[PDB]
């Protein structure tokens, strides 16, 4: 398996919880282009949540990660968001490459606050 077509990226660890919802700290953590929202969640948290076991690490489906790409603005990401559709090939983990984020993008997390996603509206 030669899989080097991914990019060690720099991601800014931030949280959109409230008091520091964009002004907390901002820690440069590293991830891959071919990460997963769940995996990125782990790496980003690992710096603060150093020592935290797998079962304790929250899945990006129960807490929402507002990705602030900057270039595209901000999008709510999840391991399965748009790929949460289980009807065929749609079930897939999201990568940062799906959002096409730049190095030095900002991720913010919220404890299941605002999974404002595509809605049903004609």
Residue 32 tokens read as 């891959």
Domain count, the chain: 1
Domain region containing 61:
1-122
Residue 49 tokens read as 């949540």
Which H, E and C letters describe 37-98, residue by residue? HHHHHHHHHHCCCCCCCCCCCCCCCCCEEEEECCCCCEEEECCCCCCCCCCCCCCCCCCHHH
Give me the CATH number covering residue 65. Answer: 3.10.20.90
């Amino acid at each position: 398996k030669k899989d080097v077509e991914y990019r060690p990226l720099t991601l800014n660890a931030l949280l959109a919880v409230g008091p520091g919802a964009g002004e907390a700290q901002g820690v440069p953590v590293k991830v891959l282009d071919c990460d997963t929202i769940s995996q990125a969640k782990e790496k980003m948290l690992d710096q603060l949540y150093k020592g935290v076991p797998l079962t304790q690490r929250p899945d990006p489906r129960t807490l929402d990660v507002e990705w602030r790409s900057g270039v595209a603005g901000h999008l709510i990401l999840s391991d399965e968001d748009v790929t949460s559709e289980v009807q065929g090939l749609f079930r897939r983990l999201n990568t940062l490459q799906h959002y096409k984020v730049p190095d030095g993008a900002t991720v913010a997390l919220v404890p299941c606050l605002t999974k404002h996603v595509l809605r049903e509206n004609q």
